[PDB]
């Protein structure tokens, strides 16, 4: 297919977790949660991330308890059998904005916004794709395209026409640590947060990988030595042939 | 006599792994078999410990896999170990087969060993296809539909065998629960066939890279080849720990993190990377019935090899044209695998057709003609007349 | 005294595998602590306790 | 799987030709030199696969001194390949030393087995 | 147990090779040897000998197939671009 | 030689089932082994064809079992065949073990055969318990609760291992998915141990009901014991077909058709009928650690048997006191099974304690004393001085 | 493979029994025989002989255990009746 149908490839930005000894910037995850809650939570879901997984990664225990209690989940029905509701706890999951898929497609002009809880693993490019898609919206589509109405141009989306309009604008969120919250800074923060939501094992996985790679490299070289020590007597074997006398 | 000989079970263990007389000349390509044994044990153990948490319904399959990833302690280790260990199992199995048809191991004392190997290869392909179908992503679902709708090309009973495979009318809950029960089951058939592989090997013993007899000096397998296998075991675990811990979703496709949706096609349906050459073989034929007949023929053409090898010396160690055309075959297989991952665009259909023809002409045309030419060159280079 | 080193550590296989296991115990403990402290000092200002001290200061 | 009477038939037709020999025997000599079995101290009749009844009878009919020399050349090739080296260049087989020594025994056993099956499938004219 | 068919490998004592005479073999204890002997010499000279003998067989088919893949990939990227649309519309239609 | 001997696999088939020399005097109690092999094949095949439709969550286990019973074709045949076949498996296994205990099959050459048999007995007890627990009825939840909660009596580690068995804090969705994965697994371990049972048998051959040597006249297994096996194969199939098609729920308990409820205890918690003697042995000790030790020692007391048999004659064919006390042991086992289905009430606990004492005094007190008395009687009855 | 240990059963030809001399065995083809010969005589007389020989060993312990079970069952039925509560309390505690 053509380059427009493929989509433009995202370049290789220098993320703070690129590299085998690195770690998510956890302040970037906290700021990215704020940008998700204030902008992305209107249309996209986070169906796989429990509230308890944020405790000790980006927020404190009470800081997560209050954000969970500001929502309302389905309780077990009362003693007369009527349905009940409940303030959220740490066991519950982060609720989406829509009750079903038809409400989503009705609210967003036929297209359904994907759940973002695995979206940097579900897309070729990963963090570079999410960042470059969010900041890739030009001010005008290139001269020649026929964009369908209700759709927007973004060259990193395959085909070009995406049903998400440009959502990130300068200083639409104020961070609580006083960071200048521009478009690029907010896209960096949400992409770090979505990468944490996809791979919440990332730090421990890289740390354990350091341990196994060190132990297994040492074992490999040490086993090369023990193989050469065992096979010394066969590698240094000498054969002499005196031809036997005819009989 | 010794207790390791005067037992029932320790007699078998002694005869196979302790006092087994190996030819002393065998190089590092003779460790792929013990490597495949290690890989099989890895797959079985990690799969059992993930099946303790997997739920197989169509509405619970994908989310049970993410429950393994996010909620089970060290469950990402288990899932990444199972997936990358399956792909490593296939790379090592391709090396085992390429060694076998380089060094002439298929030949006349060991044809039943080669054929039990081909049966093992077919069973591992089936096992990995079912296990990729159990995770129920987007490539998983649509891979299941195109591979099962292959069988609708049989002109009499095709629709009923595909409706018997599906358990219904397309890939849904009976198909996924079936594929889980079978993806458990076929590995234990593979373990039985591996025991039969070892039994067919043990009667004549292994070959050697010279292709001459190895009956003259031999080495017991314990304390020499145990440690020579330990070297490759630690190397294989090192390279697998690299791919599991630092680069885990590299060999996989990203579209298996989209849940399976029967209404949206993912615009390039490709299987896992090791089934790409057979996928390109299937894709090259402009018919579906001939396509599946040619794919099954492409894997059943390993049986015509002990009858088309027309030469008196075993292996390609001392032949130049056999070496050259062997590596033409290997890079034809790699090009076929890369053609199978591309779209059906204009140079690729011709490239896949010509590479499929080269794949079939290797076994049926190239090996007999080159074998006969090398025979008469070996004769007239050294006899005088 | 290589003869004394052999006669204490490597002559009996009971003592040999005993010190193998004792060394594996202490190696596992201090290897774990050394890898965690290196990983945390390499990732300085990025872990949670640094951000917690920042929002507590 | 190509029996040596066919190889000898084609090779004798090539060598008895004036044109075909002067084109093909240089290619075969370069093939033999590139093959590199001589660098491991082996003649070509040590290379033939011995696990059929024809070669088992040929090796059984081979005399005693030839069999001892063949066993030594085989064991030396295994020990050389075990170390991934070659033999020193004075220990290589020369072209005059690379003699076909098993070929008459193979040809005799093959003619015997061919006459055996032709007389097992004998049919009379009555 | 029953006796099975004639194989081509016996066991320790009756392997089934030819009779051996006049071959003496000598070998020293590895506890009295140096392992890792000659590794720095073999690492550069023996590896160069092995490469020099065994690289044309590997890198002529690799070169043929890599040039084929590169040329076909270039033709595809040409035909699905703006400059090469006319030949695309005559090569498929 | 013949192709059934010259081949690798066909010589194994020949040496085990075709040319295998059996003593000519062996009776119909020697068909129980072939019967148990047929039982194992029945269980494995019907289990696979039900696991193609079974879901193993705590919410869907029971209703998936009734999905098997109601709307999959011939699913009632599969479930009744699996359940009654497991019960018939245990009846035939009890006959196999009681034959071996009668005819002295545990004695001096065949102790490794007896021990591999005891390992097989333990593994199929575990398999049948897990498969009962996968139904998730009312009996299976509370049976799982009682049997798993017995491991809390281990004084330092018991709470941690019962929490590790449960996967949580009571029998729930992790416990049921664990038990399904293990109930699928352990029958393949049983098949491997059956192969090892046969390998230990083949080195010395079967015994004979005389107890004297059978090396004198022997007949091959083919066309004598193949058809003598076929008689009991068809008889077993007939009796199993009666219990599957006419009384399919007789050997069960009706409480398993109530879905599993952690909040209602069913006021009489019993396991399946074949675990009832060990349940009575466990219940008859007024302790918990001593109870679980006594049940496991009741399965492991069968290994003490080759060393406490103090007689020079193999078997009970020609002894009268050994026959009498053998049938005392057999009906003691039946009374123990009948006591295990009764409540903890007044005469039954003394009956269970006395029957437990008789069960353990058979192997440890009755057999040595009676066998040396029989030795001295055999001597002084026929020598004169 | 290597030979394993000494067993107590060989194969056809070398079973491991004693030497046999002077024993002659005769047998007729089943195709020349009558199967089901003597079934109506063995079904009534041989069956009674085998039953008469082996029934006290089976039916004396069966009688003992069935009488013990019936007596314990009757006592348990008596203890939980209206007539036998006043023994049930002084029996259990
Ligand atoms: C690094 C590239 C290596 C190039 C330099 C090596 C020397 C050389 O030119 O060898 C040519 C050599 C031809 O030598 P030969 O003696 O004619 O070959 C005889 C046998 O083929 C080979 O017989 P062998 O017993 O020698 O086989 C060992 C061989 C092959 O060993 C194996 O095949 C093991 C394969 C992998 C096992 C672990 C599998 C892990 C599973 C995942 C795999 C993912 C891929 O590995 C080695 O070659 C070790 C020597 C390396 C020397 C390195 C010198 C570097 C310059 C300084 O071809 C190879 O050695 C291929 C191996 C290269 C693999 C490394 C990458
Ligand atoms: C009723 C008894 C009438 C016949 C009689 O008086 O026999 C006394 C007879 C005296 O024993 P014996 O002949 O001195 O001892 C020879 C052995 O019993 C061994 O004798 P055998 O194995 O050659 O006799 C086979 C016996 C016993 O056959 C079996 O044990 C095979 C059981 C087949 C099990 C099929 C699946 C089970 C499914 C769960 C139930 O079956 C019969 O008794 C057929 C004769 C009528 O006792 C029995 O025949 C036991 C019958 C048990 C039923
Ligand atoms: C690039 C070309 C550099 C060539 C390096 C080289 O060829 O090294 C030759 C010797 C090898 O020494 P060796 O492999 O131990 O052989 C021992 C036999 N001797 C020499 C004692 C008789 O040289 C050496 O001992 C090298 C050892 C030092 C290398 C350190 C790592 C660099
Ligand atoms: C611990 C103590 C044990 C008892 C003491 C003792 O070890 O006893 C020593 C015995 C005695 O042997 P012997 O030859 O001296 O007998 C002389 C009799 N007169 O040796 C043995 O057990 C044999 C050990 C063999 C080891 C084989 C290892 C197999 C590895 C693979 C296992 C299976 C994997 C399958 C997958
Ligand atoms: C599927 C079919 C496959 C067929 C082939 C399978 C062969 C097994 C290949 C896998 C290697 C297993 C290595 C076992 C080594 C051994 O157990 O060694 C036993 C040796 C015997 O030493 P020695 O008697 O030489 O002592 C000479 C003087 N007594 O003790 C040792 O030195 C111990 C050395 C430490 C070994 C640690 C190995 C850890 C293995 C981890 C990976 C396991 C997988
Ligand atoms: C279709 C197969 C070929 C036709 C059969 C045939 O032609 O059988 C002819 C062969 C040859 O028999 P042979 O040993 O007498 O000859 C040997 C000299 N060639 O018999 C057999 O395969 C053996 C049959 C084995 C029976 C046991 C099977 C048990 C399975 C469980
Ligand atoms: C309101 C409606 C919103 C807001 C505020 C955001 N998104 Fe986005 N999004 C939305 C729709 C309707 C779609 C579907 C468009 C389509 O054609 O598929 C999307 C799409 C995405 C994607 C997937 C793009 C792809 O498939 O390649 C990602 C990733 C995505 N959206 C992320 C995202 C982030 C990180 C936001 C942060 C503030 C965000 N969206 C805002 C609808 C809406
Ligand atoms: C022959 C060896 C085996 C091979 C080659 C194999 C192959 C695979 C593959 C390729 C996958 C897909 C991995 C992914 O993309 O996520 C998979 C998944 C799976 N396999 Fe296997 N498998 C093997 C053995 C087993 C066994 C024996 C079991 C069961 C005990 C098992 C259980 C699973 C499960 C539960 C999944 C679910 C999806 C996941 O967790 O990744 N595997 N298998
Ligand atoms: C589960 C997969 C397999 C296992 C465990 C396995 C195991 C083994 C082992 C242990 C050996 C001996 C060591 C060696 O020679 O490398 C061996 C040899 C062999 N295997 Fe496999 N094998 C497998 C798959 C296959 C396949 C797919 C083929 C080919 C179709 C095959 C063909 C052979 C051959 C020809 C040999 C003999 C090679 C020789 O020694 O010359 N095997 N196998
Ligand atoms: C060792 C042989 C086996 C025994 C003794 C055994 C025993 C049992 C028993 C007693 C039940 C409960 C049946 C009931 O009460 O309704 C059961 C259930 C079950 N077993 Fe097995 N089983 C065996 C082998 C297998 C195997 C190999 C599989 C799987 C491939 C399997 C799959 C099942 C399934 C799915 C159930 C579900 C509930 C049902 O349909 O009854 N079984 N098993
Ligand atoms: C999966 C279950 C089992 C199978 C398939 C099995 C299979 C066999 C077979 C086929 C035989 C030879 C035929 C015969 O003698 O009856 C046999 C013999 C024997 N089995 Fe089992 N068996 C099983 C369980 C057990 C158990 C639980 C025990 C006892 C603990 C046991 C002890 C024996 C003994 C002692 C013999 C030899 C009897 C004799 O010939 O004197 N087996 N077994």
Q: CATH assignment of C1-57, given 3.30.300.30, 2.40.50.140, 1.20.5.260, 1.10.10.1400?
A: 1.20.5.260
How close is the nearest chain A Cα to the Cα of C20, in Å?
A: 15
Touch of A by F (3+ CB pairs closer than 8 Å): no
Active site residue B323: no
- Residues constituting chain D: 126
Touch of B by D (3+ CB pairs closer than 8 Å): yes
- Residues constituting chain A: 247
How close is the nearest chain G Cα to the Cα of E2, in Å?
A: 6
Longest Cα–Cα distance in chain A? 111
Which of the residues B105, B207, B272, B319 is marked catalytic? B272
Active site residue F311: no
Distance (Å) from CA B99 to ligand 1 centroid: 13
**B1 CB less than 6 Å from ligand 4?**
no
* Cβ atoms G90, G79 nearer than 8 A: no
Residues F246-260, buried b or exposed e (16+ Cβ, 10 A)?
eebeebbbebbbebb
Q: Does the CB of E24 have a partner CB in chain A at under 8 Å?
A: yes
* Cβ atoms B221, B18 nearer than 8 A: yes
How close is the nearest chain E Cα to the Cα of B170, in Å?
A: 33
How many beta-carbon contacts under 8 Å exist across A and E?
44
**Cα F293 to Cα F277: distance, rounded to the nearest angstrom:** 15
With 0-12 / 13-18 / 19 or more C-beta atoms within 10 angstroms meaning exposed / middle / buried, residue C57 is exposed
E strand or H helix at B232: helix B225-245
Cα separations in angstroms, D30 against B377, D48, E60, F206: 10, 20, 19, 67
Q: Taking the CA of residue B13 as centre, how many other CA atoms within 13 Å lie in the half-sphere pointing to its CB?
A: 8
Q: A102 and A218 in one domain?
A: no
* Cβ atoms A223, A231 nearer than 8 A: no
E strand or H helix at E12: none
**Cα E78 to Cα E70: distance, rounded to the nearest angstrom:** 12
Q: Which of F48, F112, F196 sits opposite B185 (nearest CB)?
A: F48
**Cα B79 to Cα B131: distance, rounded to the nearest angstrom:** 12
Q: Count other C-beta atoms under 10 Å from residue B339's C-beta.
A: 27
Q: Taking the CA of residue B349 as centre, how many other CA atoms within 13 Å lie in the half-sphere pointing to its CB?
A: 9
Residue D93 is given by DSSP the state P
**Cα E37 to Cα E15: distance, rounded to the nearest angstrom:** 33
Residue G71 neighbours by CB under 8 Å, 6+ apart: none
**Cα A113 to Cα A43: distance, rounded to the nearest angstrom:** 6
* Cβ atoms B210, D44 nearer than 8 A: no
F73 marked ligand binding residue:
no
Which of B330, B336, B367 lies closest to B353 in space, CA to CA? B336
Decide the pairing of beta strands A152-153 and A161-162: antiparallel
**Cα A74 to Cα A76: distance, rounded to the nearest angstrom:** 7
How close is the nearest chain A Cα to the Cα of C51, in Å?
A: 6
Which of B97, B151, B91, B149 lies closest to B120 in space, CA to CA? B97
CB atoms C51 and A27 under 8 Å: yes
Which of the residues F99, F141, F228, F319 is marked catalytic? F228
Torsion of Cα atoms, B331 then B334 then B336 then B342, to 10°: -130
Helices (H), F287-366: 289-300, 305-308, 320-339, 346-361
Q: Taking the CA of residue E48 as centre, how many other CA atoms within 13 Å lie in the half-sphere pointing to its CB?
A: 5
Residue C5 is given by DSSP the state H
Longest Cα–Cα distance in chain B? 80
Active site residue F202: yes
* Cβ atoms F101, F316 nearer than 8 A: no
**Cα A124 to Cα A126: distance, rounded to the nearest angstrom:** 6
Distance (Å) from CA F14 to ligand 6 centroid: 12
Query: Tokens 């902008």 label which residue?
Result: A39
Q: Does the CB of A237 have a partner CB in chain D at under 8 Å?
A: yes
Chains touching chain A, criterion 3+ CB pairs below 8 Å: B, C, D, E
**Cα F26 to Cα B377: distance, rounded to the nearest angstrom:** 67
How many helices (DSSP H) and strands (DSSP E) are in chain D? 5, 0
* Cβ atoms F130, F74 nearer than 8 A: no
SS3 B174: helix
* Chain D interface mutation, best of B306, B324, B377, highest count of D Cβ atoms under 10 Å: B377
Distance of CA B135 to the CA centre of its chain: 21
To 10 degrees, what angle do helices F32-51 and F75-102 make? Answer: 150
Active site residue F206: yes
Q: Is the dihedral of CA B57, B58, B63, B65 positive or negative?
A: positive
With 0-12 / 13-18 / 19 or more C-beta atoms within 10 angstroms meaning exposed / middle / buried, residue C33 is exposed
Query: The domain that contains A99 carries what CATH number?
Result: 1.10.760.10
Query: Tokens 């009667």 label which residue?
Result: B203
**F139 CB less than 6 Å from ligand 10?**
no
A1 marked ligand binding residue:
no
**Cα D47 to Cα D51: distance, rounded to the nearest angstrom:** 12
Q: A227 and A194 in one domain?
A: no
G5 interaction partners in chain B (CB closer than 8 Å): 1, 5-7
Query: Range of A70's domain?
Result: 4-200
Distance (Å) from CA B82 to ligand 8 centroid: 6
Which of F311, F369, F310, F309 lies closest to F106 in space, CA to CA? F309
B343 marked ligand binding residue:
no
Decide the pairing of beta strands B218-220 and A93-94: unpaired
Q: What are phi and psi of A27, to 5 degrees?
A: -65, -30
G12 interaction partners in chain E (CB closer than 8 Å): 2
Q: Does the CB of B268 have a partner CB in chain G at under 8 Å?
A: no
B222 marked ligand binding residue:
no
Query: The domain that contains A218 carries what CATH number?
Result: 1.20.5.100
Which of B18, B58, B195 lies closest to B119 in space, CA to CA? B195
Instruction: Locate the chain F residue with the closest alpha carbon to G61.
Output: F328
CB atoms A241 and D64 under 8 Å: no
Q: A232 and A215 in one domain?
A: yes
Q: Taking the CA of residue B380 as centre, how many other CA atoms within 13 Å lie in the half-sphere pointing to its CB?
A: 27
Q: What are phi and psi of B218, to 5 degrees?
A: -140, 155
**Cα F40 to Cα F162: distance, rounded to the nearest angstrom:** 30
Structure tokens at F42: 């029945």
With 0-12 / 13-18 / 19 or more C-beta atoms within 10 angstroms meaning exposed / middle / buried, residue B207 is buried
Q: Which domains does chain D have, with CATH numbers?
A: 1-126 (1.10.1090.10)
**Cα A215 to Cα C11: distance, rounded to the nearest angstrom:** 27
Q: Which domains does chain G have, with CATH numbers?
A: 1-93 (1.20.5.210)
∠ at Cα B48 (B45, B52), nearest 5°?
145
Which of E92, E20, F384, C27 lies closest to B217 in space, CA to CA? E20
Touch of G by D (3+ CB pairs closer than 8 Å): no
Domain range annotation of chain F? 1-385
Distance of CA C44 to the CA centre of its chain: 22
Which of the residues F64, F141, F229, F374 is marked catalytic? F229
- Structure resolution, Å: 2.8
A158 interaction partners in chain E (CB closer than 8 Å): none
Structure tokens at A175: 């961070």
SS3 A239: strand
Q: Does the CB of G30 have a partner CB in chain B at under 8 Å?
A: no
CB atoms F177 and B52 under 8 Å: yes
Structure tokens at A111: 């297209």
To 10 degrees, what angle do helices B75-102 and B61-70 make? Answer: 100
Query: Tokens 């068995």 label which residue?
Result: F165
Residue G17 neighbours by CB under 8 Å, 6+ apart: F213, F215, F216
Give the method of determination: cryo-EM
Structure tokens at F73: 């074709």
A127 marked ligand binding residue:
no
E strand or H helix at A74: strand A72-75
Phi-psi map region of G19: left, alpha, beta (phi>0 left; psi -120 to 50 alpha): beta
* Cβ atoms B145, B170 nearer than 8 A: yes
Q: A222 and A140 in one domain?
A: no
* Cβ atoms B181, B133 nearer than 8 A: no
Distance of CA G21 to the CA centre of its chain: 36
CATH architecture designation of domain F1-385: Up-down Bundle (1.20)
SS3 F1: coil
**Cα B336 to Cα A187: distance, rounded to the nearest angstrom:** 40
E strand or H helix at B272: none
Residues with CB under 6 A from ligand 3: E 38-41, 44
Residues with CB under 6 A from ligand 11: F 30, 32-34, 36-37, 40, 93, 96-97, 100, 103, 105-106, 110, 113-114, 117-118, 120-121, 190, 194, 197, 201, 206-207
Domain range annotation of chain C? 1-57
What is the number of the ligand closest to the CA of F9?
Answer: 6
CB atoms E5 and F6 under 8 Å: yes
∠ at Cα B374 (B368, B376), nearest 5°?
105
Terminal alpha carbon distance of chain D = 36
């Amino acid at each position: 297919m053509t380059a427009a149908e493929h989509g433009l490839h995202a370049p290789a930005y220098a993320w703070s977790h690129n590299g085998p000894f690195e770690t998510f910037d956890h302040a970037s995850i906290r700021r990215g949660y704020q940008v998700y809650r204030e902008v992305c939570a209107a249309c996209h879901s986070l169906d796989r991330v429990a509230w308890r997984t944020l405790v000790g990664v980006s927020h404190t225990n009470e800081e997560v308890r209050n954000m969970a209690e500001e929502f309302e989940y389905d309780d077990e029905p009362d003693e007369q059998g009527n349905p009940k509701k409940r303030p959220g706890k740490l066991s519950d999951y982060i609720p989406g904005p829509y009750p079903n898929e038809q409400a989503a497609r009705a609210a967003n002009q036929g297209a359904l916004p994907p759940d973002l809880s695995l979206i940097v693993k579900a897309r070729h490019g990963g963090c570079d794709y999410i960042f470059s898609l969010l900041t890739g919206y030009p001010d005008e589509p290139p001269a020649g395209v026929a964009l369908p109405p209700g759709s927007n141009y973004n060259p990193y989306f395959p085909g070009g026409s995406i049903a998400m309009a440009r959502v990130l604008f300068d200083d639409m969120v104020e961070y609580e640590d006083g960071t200048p919250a521009t478009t690029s800074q907010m896209a960096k923060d949400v992409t770090t947060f979505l990468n944490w939501c996809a791979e919440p094992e990332h730090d421990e996985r890289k740390r354990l990988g350091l341990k196994t790679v060190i132990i297994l490299s040492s074992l490999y070289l040490l086993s090369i030595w023990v193989k050469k020590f065992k096979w010394a007597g066969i590698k240094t074997r000498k054969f002499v042939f005196n031809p036997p006398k005819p009989r | 006599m010794a207790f390791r000989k005067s037992n029932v079970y320790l007699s078998l263990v002694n005869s196979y792994i302790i006092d087994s007389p190996q030819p002393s000349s065998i190089n590092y390509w003779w460790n792929m078999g013990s490597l495949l044994g290690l890989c099989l044990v890895i797959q079985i153990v990690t799969g059992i410990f993930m099946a303790m948490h997997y739920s197989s319904n169509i509405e619970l399959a994908f989310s049970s896999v993410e429950h393994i990833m996010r909620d089970v302690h060290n469950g990402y280790i288990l899932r990444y170990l199972h997936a990358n260990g399956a792909s490593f199992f296939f790379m090592v199995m391709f090396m085992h087969m390429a060694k076998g048809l380089y060094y002439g191991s298929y030949r006349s004392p060991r044809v039943t060993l080669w054929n039990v190997g081909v049966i093992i290869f077919i069973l591992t392909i089936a096992t990995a296809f079912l296990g990729y179908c159990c995770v129920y992503g987007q490539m998983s679902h649509w891979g299941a539909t195109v591979i099962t709708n292959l069988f609708s090309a049989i002109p009499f009973v095709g629709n009923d065998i595909v409706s018997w495979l599906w358990g219904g009318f397309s890939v849904s809950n009976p198909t996924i629960q079936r594929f889980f029960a079978l993806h458990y089951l076929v590995p234990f058939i593979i373990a039985a066939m591996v025991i039969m592989h070892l039994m067919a090997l043990h009667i004549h013993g292994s070959s050697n890279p010279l292709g001459i007899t190895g009956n003259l000096d031999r080495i017991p397998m314990h304390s020499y080849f145990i440690f020579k296998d330990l070297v490759t075991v630690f190397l294989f675990m090192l390279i697998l720990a690299l791919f599991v811990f630092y680069s885990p979703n590299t060999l996989g496709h990203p579209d298996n993190y989209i849940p399976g949706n029967p209404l949206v096609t993912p615009a390039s349906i490709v299987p896992e990377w090791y089934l790409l050459p057979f996928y390109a073989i299937l894709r090259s034929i402009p018919d579906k019935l001939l396509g599946v007949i040619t794919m099954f023929a492409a894997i059943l053409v390993l049986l015509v090899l002990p009858f088309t090898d027309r030469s008196v010396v075993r292996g390609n160690t001392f032949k130049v044209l056999s070496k050259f055309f062997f590596f033409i075959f290997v890079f034809n297989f790699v090009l076929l695998g890369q053609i199978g991952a591309c779209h059906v665009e204009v140079p690729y259909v011709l490239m896949g057709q010509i590479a499929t023809f080269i794949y079939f002409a290797y076994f049926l045309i190239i090996v007999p003609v080159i074998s006969t030419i090398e025979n008469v060159l070996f004769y007239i280079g050294r006899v005088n007349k | 005294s290589f003869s004394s080193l052999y006669k204490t550590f490597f002559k009996r296989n009971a003592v040999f595998v005993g010190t193998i296991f004792a060394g594996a115990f202490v190696f596992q403990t201090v290897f774990d602590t050394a890898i965690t402290s290196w990983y945390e000092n390499h990732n300085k200002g990025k872990l949670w306790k640094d951000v917690k001290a920042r929002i507590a200061a | 799987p190509q029996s040596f009477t066919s190889i000898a038939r084609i090779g004798d037709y090539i060598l008895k030709s004036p044109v075909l020999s002067k084109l093909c025997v240089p290619v075969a000599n370069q093939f033999i030199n590139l093959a590199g079995y001589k660098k491991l101290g082996l003649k070509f009749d040590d290379l033939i696969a011995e696990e059929n009844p024809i070669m088992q009878t040929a090796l059984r009919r081979l005399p005693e001194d030839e069999s001892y020399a063949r066993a030594y050349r085989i064991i030396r090739a295994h020990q050389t390949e075990l170390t991934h080296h070659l033999l020193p260049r004075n220990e290589w087989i020369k072209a005059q030393e690379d003699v076909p020594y098993l070929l008459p025994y193979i040809l005799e056993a093959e003619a015997a087995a061919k006459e055996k099956d032709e007389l097992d499938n004998i049919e009379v004219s009555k | 147990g029953p006796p099975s068919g004639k194989t081509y490998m016996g066991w320790w004592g009756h392997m089934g090779g030819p009779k051996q005479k006049g071959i003496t073999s000598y070998a020293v204890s590895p506890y009295a040897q140096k392992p890792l002997q000659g590794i720095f010499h073999n690492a550069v000279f023996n590896s160069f000998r092995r490469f020099k003998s065994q690289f044309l067989y590997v890198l002529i088919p690799a070169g043929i197939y890599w040039y084929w893949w590169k040329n076909g990939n270039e033709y595809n990227e040409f035909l699905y671009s703006k400059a090469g649309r006319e030949e695309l519309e005559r090569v498929n239609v």
